[PDB]
Symmetry: C2
């Protein structure tokens, strides 16, 4: 199995969201090369479809993009917690929903060229509204598949986890029209 | 959009390397309070979904140091200043896979990791391919791709987006044939 073994590591930055480290790696050459590596805790994201066929989403400002975008609910993985608990808490905290099922769908790196961020997508079935930070600014949104598709066309939906989510719903519907 | 816009009140550059720049912005929240924003700057990429005449999706195995793993991905390359990304897509396909193509049309653009990076991927679909070490070259039927997702050999978001595009082709060809 191919490897670029780390022979040196320089910790460049250790912030609230990301760490940056520069790894010095051997090449088959015998020469060395720098590898810039953003380390990130990982994220749970939730595909939550209401009993009304509306997918639940949030709009928020993404400072690296200088724009607000429309995303599925997501939050960071916590150390020593079940990611499925994390998805349940993030669904309820971000969108005030409870669900019956929360089932792991797929996991993937978002930009593995420089980051080790992994997103774990969970599908939530059986949604109902729970009743009862000042620095958090999210906007709760519920869309039909066709509206989500139109939001893609408008680039209001503009990130990898949410594109994947929308495409999944498209597929679930197309295979729901492979039995009618 | 500009909902809940957070104006930069002060930028500090942390790092400027080969692939990533890192900066820290002080920002004004919508409620007037201050907060800090960690921002990786990255060039942005073009990626190609290529389906052969055998109806296989064209992929390449790539070593990904941040993952400590080799994963199976659709061909991709860095944007080039001044060059139409469609032209960049055609070159990247050809030098990564040896395929030329008769059609290269833009499908979708998205930010990979908007929580912290400004990396945008531009995905193009290459149709009508033909061949002109290529050892990392990997061609997969839909069902092998779905099995590669099960083994997590396919494991980044642009490639998953591509397998799902192949899946949607199959579940829509099945409505007309």
């Amino acid at each position: 199995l191919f490897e670029e073994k780390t022979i040196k590591t320089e910790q460049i930055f250790s912030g609230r969201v990301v760490k940056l480290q520069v790894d010095d790696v051997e090449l088959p050459n015998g020469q060395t090369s720098k590898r810039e590596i953003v380390r990130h805790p990982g994220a749970v994201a939730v595909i939550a479809i209401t009993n009304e066929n509306k997918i639940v989403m949030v709009e928020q400002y993404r400072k690296p993009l200088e724009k607000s975008i429309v995303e599925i609910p997501a939050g960071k993985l916590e150390k020593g917690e079940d990611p499925r608990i994390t998805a349940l808490r993030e669904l309820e905290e971000e969108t005030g929903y409870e669900c019956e099922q929360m089932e792991w769908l797929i996991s993937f790196a978002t930009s593995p060229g420089f980051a080790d961020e992994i997103i774990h997508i969970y599908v939530a079935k059986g949604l109902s509204k729970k009743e009862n930070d000042e620095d958090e600014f999210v906007d709760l949104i519920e869309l039909t598949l066709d509206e989500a598709l139109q939001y893609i066309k408008e680039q209001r939906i503009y990130d990898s986890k949410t594109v994947i989510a929308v495409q999944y719903l498209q597929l679930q519907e197309a295979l729901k029209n492979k039995l009618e």
